[PDB]
Amino acid sequence: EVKILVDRDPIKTSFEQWAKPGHFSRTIAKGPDTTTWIWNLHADAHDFDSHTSDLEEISRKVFSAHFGQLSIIFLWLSGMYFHGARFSNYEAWLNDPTHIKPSAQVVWPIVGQEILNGDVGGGFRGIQITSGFFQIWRASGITSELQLYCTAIGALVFAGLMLFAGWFHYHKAAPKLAWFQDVESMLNHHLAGLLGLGSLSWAGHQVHVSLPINQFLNAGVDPKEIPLPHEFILNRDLLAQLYPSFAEGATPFFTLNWSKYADFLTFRGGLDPLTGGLWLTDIAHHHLAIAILFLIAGHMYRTNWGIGHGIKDILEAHKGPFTGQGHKGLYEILTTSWHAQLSINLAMLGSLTIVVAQHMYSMPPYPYLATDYATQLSLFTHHMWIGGFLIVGAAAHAAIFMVRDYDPTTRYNDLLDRVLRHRDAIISHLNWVCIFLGFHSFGLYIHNDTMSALGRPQDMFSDTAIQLQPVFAQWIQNTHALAPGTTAPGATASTSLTWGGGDLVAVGGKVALLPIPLGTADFLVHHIHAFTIHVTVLILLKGVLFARSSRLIPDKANLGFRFPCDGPGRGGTCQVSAWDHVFLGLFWMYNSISVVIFHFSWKMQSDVWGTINDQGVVTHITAGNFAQSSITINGWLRDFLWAQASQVIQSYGSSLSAYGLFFLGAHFVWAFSLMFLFSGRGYWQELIESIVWAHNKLKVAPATQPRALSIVQGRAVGVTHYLLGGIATTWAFFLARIIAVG
Amino acid sequence: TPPELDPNTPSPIFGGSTGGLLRKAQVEEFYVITWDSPKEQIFEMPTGGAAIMREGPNLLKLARKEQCLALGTRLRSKYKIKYQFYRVFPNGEVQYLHPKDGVYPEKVNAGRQGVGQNFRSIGKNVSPIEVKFTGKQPYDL
Amino acid sequence: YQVIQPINGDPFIGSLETPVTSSPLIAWYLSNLPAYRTAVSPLLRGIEVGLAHGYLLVGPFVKAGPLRNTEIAGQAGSLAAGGLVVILSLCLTIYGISSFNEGAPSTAPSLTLTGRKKEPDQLQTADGWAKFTGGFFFGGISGVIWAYFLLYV
Amino acid sequence: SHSVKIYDTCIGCTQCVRACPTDVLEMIPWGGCKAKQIASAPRTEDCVGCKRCESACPTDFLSVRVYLWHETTRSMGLAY
Amino acid sequence: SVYFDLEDLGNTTGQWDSYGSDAPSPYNPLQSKLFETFAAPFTKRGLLLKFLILGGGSTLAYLSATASGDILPITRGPQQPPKLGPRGKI
Amino acid sequence: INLPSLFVPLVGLLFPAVAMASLFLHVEK
Amino acid sequence: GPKRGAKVKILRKESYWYKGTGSVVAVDQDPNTRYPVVVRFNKVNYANVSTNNYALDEIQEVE
Amino acid sequence: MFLISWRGYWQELIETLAWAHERTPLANLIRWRDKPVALSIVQARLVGLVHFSVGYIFTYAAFLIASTSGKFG
Ligand code: CLA
Ligand code: CLA
Ligand code: CLA
Ligand code: CLA
Ligand code: CLA
Ligand code: CLA
Ligand SMILES: CC1=C(/C=C/C(C)=C/C=C/C(C)=C/C=C/C=C(C)/C=C/C=C(C)/C=C/C2=C(C)CCCC2(C)C)C(C)(C)CCC1
Ligand SMILES: CC1=C(C/C=C(\C)CCC[C@H](C)CCC[C@H](C)CCCC(C)C)C(=O)c2ccccc2C1=O
Ligand SMILES: CC1=C(C/C=C(\C)CCC[C@H](C)CCC[C@H](C)CCCC(C)C)C(=O)c2ccccc2C1=O
Ligand code: SF4
Ligand code: SF4
Ligand code: SF4
Numbered sequence A: 001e002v003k004i005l006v007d008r009d010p011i012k013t014s015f016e017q018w019a020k021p022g023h024f025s026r027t028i029a030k031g032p033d034t035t036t037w038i039w040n041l042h043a044d045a046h047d048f049d050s051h052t053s054d055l056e057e058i059s060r061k062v063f064s065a066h067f068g069q070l071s072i073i074f075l076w077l078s079g080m081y082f083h084g085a086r087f088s089n090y091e092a093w094l095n096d097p098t099h100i101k102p103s104a105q106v107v108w109p110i111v112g113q114e115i116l117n118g119d120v121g122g123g124f125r126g127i128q129i130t131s132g133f134f135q136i137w138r139a140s141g142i143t144s145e146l147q148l149y150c151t152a153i154g155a156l157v158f159a160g161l162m163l164f165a166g167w168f169h170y171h172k173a174a175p176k177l178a179w180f181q182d183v184e185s186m187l188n189h190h191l192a193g194l195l196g197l198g199s200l201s202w203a204g205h206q207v208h209v210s211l212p213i214n215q216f217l218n219a220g221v222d223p224k225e226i227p228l229p230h231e232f233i234l235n236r237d238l239l240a241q242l243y244p245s246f247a248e249g250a251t252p253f254f255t256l257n258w259s260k261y262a263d264f265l266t267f268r269g270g271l272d273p274l275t276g277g278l279w280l281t282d283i284a285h286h287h288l289a290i291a292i293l294f295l296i297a298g299h300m301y302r303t304n305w306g307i308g309h310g311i312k313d314i315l316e317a318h319k320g321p322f323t324g325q326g327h328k329g330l331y332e333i334l335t336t337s338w339h340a341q342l343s344i345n346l347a348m349l350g351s352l353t354i355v356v357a358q359h360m361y362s363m364p365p366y367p368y369l370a371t372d373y374a375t376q377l378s379l380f381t382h383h384m385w386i387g388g389f390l391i392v393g394a395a396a397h398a399a400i401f402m403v404r405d406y407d408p409t410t411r412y413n414d415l416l417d418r419v420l421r422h423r424d425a426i427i428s429h430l431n432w433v434c435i436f437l438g439f440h441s442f443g444l445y446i447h448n449d450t451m452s453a454l455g456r457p458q459d460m461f462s463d464t465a466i467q468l469q470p471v472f473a474q475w476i477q478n479t480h481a482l483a484p485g486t487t488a489p490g491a492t493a494s495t496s497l498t499w500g501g502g503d504l505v506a507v508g509g510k511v512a513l514l515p516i517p518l519g520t521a522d523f524l525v526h527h528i529h530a531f532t533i534h535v536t537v538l539i540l541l542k543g544v545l546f547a548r549s550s551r552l553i554p555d556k557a558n559l560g561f562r563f564p565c566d567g568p569g570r571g572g573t574c575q576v577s578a579w580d581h582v583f584l585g586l587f588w589m590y591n592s593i594s595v596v597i598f599h600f601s602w603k604m605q606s607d608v609w610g611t612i613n614d615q616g617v618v619t620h621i622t623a624g625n626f627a628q629s630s631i632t633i634n635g636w637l638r639d640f641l642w643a644q645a646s647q648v649i650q651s652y653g654s655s656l657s658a659y660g661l662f663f664l665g666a667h668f669v670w671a672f673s674l675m676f677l678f679s680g681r682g683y684w685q686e687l688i689e690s691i692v693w694a695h696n697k698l699k700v701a702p703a704t705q706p707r708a709l710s711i712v713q714g715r716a717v718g719v720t721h722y723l724l725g726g727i728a729t730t731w732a733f734f735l736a737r738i739i740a741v742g
Numbered sequence B: 001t002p003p004e005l006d007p008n009t010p011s012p013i014f015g016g017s018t019g020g021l022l023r024k025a026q027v028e029e030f031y032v033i034t035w036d037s038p039k040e041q042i043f044e045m046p047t048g049g050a051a052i053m054r055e056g057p058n059l060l061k062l063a064r065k066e067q068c069l070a071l072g073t074r075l076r077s078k079y080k081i082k083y084q085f086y087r088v089f090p091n092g093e094v095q096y097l098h099p100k101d102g103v104y105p106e107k108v109n110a111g112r113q114g115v116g117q118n119f120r121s122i123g124k125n126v127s128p129i130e131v132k133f134t135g136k137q138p139y140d141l
Numbered sequence C: 001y002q003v004i005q006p007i008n009g010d011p012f013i014g015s016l017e018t019p020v021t022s023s024p025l026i027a028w029y030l031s032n033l034p035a036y037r038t039a040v041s042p043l044l045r046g047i048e049v050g051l052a053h054g055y056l057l058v059g060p061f062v063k064a065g066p067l068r069n070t071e072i073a074g075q076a077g078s079l080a081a082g083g084l085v086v087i088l089s090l091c092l093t094i095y096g097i098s099s100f101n102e103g104a105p106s107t108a109p110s111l112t113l114t115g116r117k118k119e120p121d122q123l124q125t126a127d128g129w130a131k132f133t134g135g136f137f138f139g140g141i142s143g144v145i146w147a148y149f150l151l152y153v
Numbered sequence D: 001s002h003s004v005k006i007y008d009t010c011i012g013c014t015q016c017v018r019a020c021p022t023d024v025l026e027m028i029p030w031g032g033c034k035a036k037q038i039a040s041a042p043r044t045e046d047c048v049g050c051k052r053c054e055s056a057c058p059t060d061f062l063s064v065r066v067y068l069w070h071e072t073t074r075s076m077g078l079a080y
Numbered sequence E: 001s002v003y004f005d006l007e008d009l010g011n012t013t014g015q016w017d018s019y020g021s022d023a024p025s026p027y028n029p030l031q032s033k034l035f036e037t038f039a040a041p042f043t044k045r046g047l048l049l050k051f052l053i054l055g056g057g058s059t060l061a062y063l064s065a066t067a068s069g070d071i072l073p074i075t076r077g078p079q080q081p082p083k084l085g086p087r088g089k090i
Numbered sequence F: 001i002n003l004p005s006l007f008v009p010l011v012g013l014l015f016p017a018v019a020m021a022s023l024f025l026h027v028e029k
Numbered sequence G: 001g002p003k004r005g006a007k008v009k010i011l012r013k014e015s016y017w018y019k020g021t022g023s024v025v026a027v028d029q030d031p032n033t034r035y036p037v038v039v040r041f042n043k044v045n046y047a048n049v050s051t052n053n054y055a056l057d058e059i060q061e062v063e
Numbered sequence H: 001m002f003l004i005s006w007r008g009y010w011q012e013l014i015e016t017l018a019w020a021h022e023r024t025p026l027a028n029l030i031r032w033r034d035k036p037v038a039l040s041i042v043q044a045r046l047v048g049l050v051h052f053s054v055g056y057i058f059t060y061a062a063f064l065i066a067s068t069s070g071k072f073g
Helices: A036-043 A055-086 A090-095 A133-139 A145-172 A183-219 A236-242 A244-248 A280-297 A311-317 A338-362 A373-404 A414-421 A423-453 A471-482 A520-545 A578-608 A633-644 A657-678 A681-697 A711-740 B023-027 B065-078 C024-031 C042-064 C073-099 C126-152 D052-056 E029-038 E045-065 F004-028 H007-022 H041-069
Strands: A006-008 A103-105 A118-121 A124-128 A173-175 A505-507 A510-513 B030-037 B041-044 B050-053 B056-062 B083-088 B094-098 D003-007 D026-029 D037-040 D064-067 G007-010 G021-027 G037-040 G051-054 G059-061
Touching (some): A055 A103, A055 A145, A055 A173, A090 A133, A090 A145, A183 A236, A183 A280, A236 A244, A373 A578, A373 A711, A414 A423, A423 A520, A657 A711, B030 B065, B065 B083, B065 B094, C042 C126, C042 E029, C073 E045, C126 E029, D003 D037, D052 D064, E045 F004
Antiparallel strands (some): A006 A173, A103 A124, A118 A124, B030 B083, B041 B050, D003 D064, G007 G059
């Protein structure tokens, strides 16, 4: 019987706990004897499992926490809209999107930083933004700064509401555990109410506000001269002038004469030639269909009426000869353990962010986006990074479940057990396939470097020597290019210009998109991707599968999820914990994503982006050198890194100088991590002994005894500074490069 | 007191895994742990996976002594059950290992002679130069 | 019915019995390989193994080697294959010298799946391994020569 | 094998013995401390050298000490 | 229904021959005699080692010392006139 | 160029083979 | 020996509080006790311990 | 690599590889005489430092000689 369950006033609201650091932990609440205390206070702050054993209290904590997060995000959006209204060149940009650089940040004039306010156009001086907000705002039909202001106020209000909701649902009316456990209902409401009504109502805004205003903008009429959005709702005559379907109102909808609505609900595909973005009509139709799909999907699970599936039933129905009991027991696991859920959701959300990156490069959804190379590069890189991080997190919390929540005596599952019983085979096979992949991908590169160095280019792996064609990908390309004529008749063009066949979409003299050629170089990089991903998976999966025990450490589970080791014995057992596997997996994720974004950058600058001359002459940014240059490590070293770092290294004395500063700073932080990664806390402790002596000599030794960081924190600081450094380096490199030569 | 005898008692219910014995058991040595369970019940295997201990006598062969003391520790701590374990050589010989004198080493028991006990504080160890060119270590004195 | 069972019924031996490991087709296949002819002279086994391996070895050397696009492709590739045959024979030889003492008996299993006693493979002895290596060299070179003949004569 | 030594600063809290994962240490009668007992290491052939015992010892300085020495298949924690 | 036996430590520790067959020689008798007589010299591991090392080195030295210029560019040598160094140096 | 064609493969292939085999047998004994 | 609550200097070289001062808690009168002098310190050691046993020749009453 | 990742990870990995070898037919016929284990902690530090130093020296040597002799001042 699914219903609203809530406890009234579980926790009194008082600043008393604010004045007592570490209140959540009986150990930390006692106070500091050494400095280590401090770090612990922050490390275990959000580890609610180590706070209480009660699943209910934890669930409440996470719920209000989520409200806090949403509040923060609303405040963030509020900031973006407000800065877009008060400190930007957005209207000017609307007047001329093809020759004005998007800027929504200005700096104050002190210590010379005024130079950062550069000539972005529109009679405005500031920092060029690469978030892509301007194209969103144009797509939403926003024309004035006033509307941006109003959206900012709305977002601020929503921030207040989310914060209050957090306080309310923690201190005043806190849901019961059964409420959180109503997964059938939660799934129904999230499928139908969130996504369904979300894309439905959004389709509403698109059909009533986006389409008309954008039609006007594309027509060329001055934005101020364009009718306000509410008028298109009040006066249906305007929409009728733009799309005659509205003359018949909602009649063809109910009478099933949907063909009449082909004016604003299309299925053309490809890109709009005068904007370089997907057709907004296609987008509106897309959101309508999606809305229907999710709406019907949200009626799958049984709640307070007979109809509907039971999750446990569907799970217990799937069991084979190879797997025995199958998915039985998983419902209980996934309705009592937050870490399992977090694992699944992190893996899938990360993967989703990755697919978002790819789909947004290859099918530009916003007007004047494809030709804003800075924005595209930025979006791709950003979402790729977010994805990778979320995935590593999925590994972490999978392992955390494996150590803290797994209990085969009370919550047994056959699949998990069987996985555990042949983990050696799984990990060994992953190992082998990783070595094979490494050899047969990187080894090709080294082979090429050697042959090239020895004066034997005819012995290389390339398109002009020993060819390794991506036949399968080429076939998929051709198939997807010929699809509109055969297997998708209702579609006018392809879903993306990047497919093997097609024309070329250009906007304002710049290339928006064109068919992307795939050769030996692409085979090579793709197999590098497969390799790096496989290694990352090797590390993480090994980490979670051996989190509880191994032949080396039979009782590793009792040591916890996060611990440095089990001593120098057994030959040495450093980094045996699953946490340390998350730690190594982070480095490998960094590696993989780095080579991925380099792949994207070089390929785009070489074979896609660039200017287009009259009669159809396309001049790319790096003139198609990829196919010949990316086949050796030296090519990446010289033609990519060395050649393209030019913009960042000579950005001094201009508006892009901050990128030079960040280039150097990031290199510095990266190197700085190596001190932590390469060393150990014993040395630091003894050094600290000497320094402490010096402080005692002058009566200035603190009561909170100065301690070297723990082994684990040394590792965490190490990997954190390593990632921050490397990623920020590629950040500065990318942005300076693409902003200067774009 | 005489050590426990080692007969052929039934093994726990388990579908088999890849974490069991290897060639070391055949050529060098393996181990055997026995216990007496009040009922049929699930326990986690030291080598990974879940097994079912039967009621009465149970005998499990493992690859390392550490696995044996691990499992035994989990038995005594979780299931409140006494355990023993032995080492087994390829020739067939069995060596009784734990608990050595019938009493757990945590609690004192008369009869045990000291091994490796230095009757001096740790700081009073001689410098390495004192033992140069000898076979002795400063902690062997 | 279930598909995966403990190895030979023993759930505490570090392996599992799957269709890949133990099914009639694969079992018959492996048991008929020269390596598992546990009751025959290791010399003949060596001849077969070396023959097959040298024969396959001729392929990739000829087509992928540095002289693949020259009139002297077959000679070069086959020679290289013979070279690898020699090197691998050297490897096998030192493996035999290092692993088995002339006095030491067979280290091969002396039991079957059923549990009955049988004569240990003489492949796991010094003399036996030496014979196997001789067979790998003879058969290796012979296989290279034969493949080269079929390919270019 | 590794070497394990007990020193007379031992106060017989037995923490090290119940910390060993391979049953190396044990408690024997003694008169040097109030607890009437001292630690002992009769089975260092099974010692892996993890040093959990040292991490369990309360005394300053340690009354149990592990000197990693000759390396064997048992001390390497190998199961193969 | 047990798997522990002191008298039979072989079955206890899974020391089985999983795929070894007790079948007699399936090979060609004439070819068997051929190989048993002709491949015999290489069945002495010391002599085989000496023969493979010395013979292999000898062969390598042969094909190396007599390598044609049409095979190895290193034996053919330079065929174009030399270029002058950066600072007018030979 | 005459001698190098003899000595180079001698030191680069034969010598390390002999040495590695010898050291292998020595260390394995 | 020294009285209870007496401020003593540590003479044991391998002690965390070597050359430092602590307070006497109790002295074991059993002559078989090798380290009777129970001492407590203001700061904990690397093992989070604030108390330790010493011998008569390992403490020095000062003020 | 040798400086950042430490022993236990590799030791366990190698354990799974040892299992892999003892359970792979044909390859089963070949067995090691010295048990495969992960490098020791100190050994790891040394090997890591060695790769680091060699890389350092060789890289800077190549740059030095190439940049200088490429133009000869
Ligand atoms: C994440 C969102 C975000 C970010 C990164 C920024 C960033 C910026 N804003 Mg923007 N802003 C935002 C949201 C954001 N804003 C929102 C939602 C609004 C609407 C209210 C604004 C309205 C706004 C205006 C009107 C201006 C800016 C300006 C700026 C710039 C200078 C900031 C400054 O120096 O403040 C001033 C610095 C301080 C106030 C420092 C005091 C910090 C105190 C001492 C900390 C005390 C700790 C304590 C716990 C915090 C208070 C808690 C409180 C509950 C009591 C900087 C780029 C300026 C600008 O861009 O000029 C060209 C500017 O004029 N912002
Ligand atoms: C506004 C009045 C108010 C007061 C007096 C309290 C008081 C309390 N809360 Mg409650 N709560 C409130 C509002 C309030 N809350 C709101 C608005 C929410 C929704 C977020 C919650 C949700 C909530 C949860 C889930 C929990 C509490 C808990 C508590 C108790 C301990 C918390 C504590 O002392 O740490 C004080 C914490 C801080 C001073 C840090 C604030 C952290 C902010 C909000 C995060 C955002 C910072 C952001 C990242 C900026 C970083 C910038 C840059 C440096 C990176 C204490 C009685 C805890 C409890 O009862 O334990 C048994 C507990 O688990 N509260
Ligand atoms: C889906 C979101 C999400 C949520 C809710 C959690 C929640 C949790 N994680 Mg998980 N995790 C996630 C994603 C998430 N994680 C991701 C994406 C990764 C990959 C990096 C991980 C990898 C991971 C590890 C390895 C561990 C956790 C742990 C935890 C638990 C304790 C967290 C804590 O208290 O730290 C307090 C929060 C901090 C100390 C924040 C500081 C983090 C760095 C310093 C900030 C980075 C700098 C920033 C980018 C820029 C700085 C600019 C300037 C300030 C210099 C908590 C349940 C821990 C645990 O024990 O679980 C039981 C744990 O050991 N997580
Ligand atoms: C690791 C990737 C890789 C690959 C695929 C190649 C491939 C090649 N190299 Mg290159 N090389 C590499 C890395 C690689 N190299 C690196 C990193 C360097 C720097 C040290 C070099 C330096 C180099 C030089 C100096 C030369 C080559 C040459 C060659 C060519 C001939 C090689 C040869 O004769 O071997 C023989 C090939 C084999 C023995 C094949 C064995 C593998 C088989 C397929 C295994 C089959 C297993 C089976 C599928 C499993 C199931 C069994 C079941 C069916 C029964 C060949 C195209 C030569 C050339 O001129 O190229 C044009 C040459 O002169 N390489
Ligand atoms: C000791 C320093 C030294 C070094 C670094 C070199 C280096 C070289 N020699 Mg030269 N060589 C040397 C001394 C040295 N030589 C001396 C003193 C003689 C007179 C006997 C020669 C006679 C010689 C000839 C005829 C040729 C070379 C050639 C070469 C080149 C190829 C390597 C080779 O095959 O030589 C082989 C070297 C020898 C046969 C003589 C060395 C014998 C000494 C007495 C023992 C050395 C043992 C050594 C220290 C052990 C190190 C390994 C150990 C640590 C494991 C290489 C640049 C070849 C060449 O120039 O190609 C372009 C070539 O054809 N060398
Ligand atoms: C440092 C010493 C050294 C020397 C002198 C050589 C010499 C050679 N290598 Mg290289 N190689 C070396 C080290 C060396 N290698 C190392 C360290 C690596 C790994 C980085 C390689 C990786 C490599 C690859 C992948 C390839 C070579 C190849 C070659 C041959 C050049 C291609 C050619 O056109 O020749 C012409 C070659 C022939 C016409 C066929 C050669 C047949 C030989 C001479 C028969 C010898 C038989 C005899 C039993 C050898 C036993 C020696 C042993 C007992 C010591 C040439 C013989 C190529 C090759 O072997 O082509 C077949 C080739 O593909 N090498
Ligand atoms: C951007 C942004 C924002 C804003 C937002 C908005 C503005 C929203 C809106 C929203 C909306 C405005 C929504 C709406 C919705 C509606 C709906 C969802 C409706 C539905 C309906 C229906 C579904 C119907 C049905 C029916 C039919 C069809 C017939 C029969 C009867 C009935 C009636 C049942 C904020 C500030 C937050 C923040 C910042 C960002
Ligand atoms: C450098 C380094 C340290 C030393 C780093 C330390 C001790 C970090 C602490 C440094 C800060 C600056 C001390 C905290 C400062 C206080 C907050 C006081 C602030 C004073 C104001 C002026 C800001 C380790 O402890 C360590 C441990 C394990 C592996 C590697 C390493 C390692 O590489
Ligand atoms: C990769 C890695 C391994 C795995 C590496 C292994 C097992 C070494 C394998 C090397 C192979 C066998 C040979 C490699 C080729 C060498 C060039 C051989 C040189 C031999 C000299 C005598 C010349 C560890 O064991 C390890 C241990 C502790 C900390 C870090 C690490 C670590 O990072
Ligand atoms: S982590 Fe530090 S302490 Fe723990 S084992 Fe590795 S080295 Fe020894
Ligand atoms: S080191 Fe580990 S194993 Fe050796 S004795 Fe101390 S605790 Fe027992
Ligand atoms: S821990 Fe230190 S003190 Fe306690 S018993 Fe073992 S040795 Fe004696």
